[PDB]
Amino acid sequence: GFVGIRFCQECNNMLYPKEDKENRILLYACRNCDYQQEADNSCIYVNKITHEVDELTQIIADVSQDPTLPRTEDHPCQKCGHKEAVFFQSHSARAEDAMRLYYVCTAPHCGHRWTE
Template sequence: MSAYDINGSPAPEGKGDDSKKISFRFCRECSNMLYPKEDRMSNTLMFACRTCQFSEQAAASCIWRNSLKEDVQETAGNVDDVAQDPTVGSDSPSDTYMTEDEGDDDELDIEAQDFEPEMCTMCGQEILCPICERPTDAHLSLEVPDEAELSEEEASDAVEAEKRERQQSSA
């Protein structure tokens, strides 16, 4: 937690590390937050409620501290929650974009939830397919045999397979 302790009144009285912390104080009558106020008659620091007339004398004279270095030190190296974050990518980016479907022969199953941009949003450079390392075509890389080397039946099958892939990726 941060250097600000959110316990109720009264503030901790221990010296040492607790003396550096500034605690929020709450009204004992209406449970609203107490704010620092000067008692001009006795020249002392008081904590007063803004909704009711409750006030109490402040145990410490520090009411605000700008501690930038403490905040950085508390969070440095704290990466436990990052390992559990599902939005952080895996080690192998090719595994998340395309996986081979064991039921079909050489057809790639592309999940609709995966999104691979065509251009890098930082530098504008074209992004290549993680498997074949060729430019992507609307987030889709299909390998189709050369139609000149295929028979007419194989060529029509290849076109149908490409149409099925495009329908699956747009669904």
């Protein structure tokens, strides 16, 4: 789980958290405005030391139409089942230690991505 910023309703600004000492609940107040709203996530901050980020969430379907990217026929897609497919490394800095590939289907209207 994570936590997202929730803007105010009137002034549209950052809402800081607040622990209601009276009702013993979690609130989000506004620095300028006096807006209040009862919380639901019951979380404030989370830190990912390992930074276990799913590279698949960053990959996009447009990478398929790349003329300088390798292609293989031995890793067909799952949904559509097309043969042609591309593969490449994380291509992201701060790579811990892994060249695990990220296969992407090479066909319109699919944009599927997987890993083996």
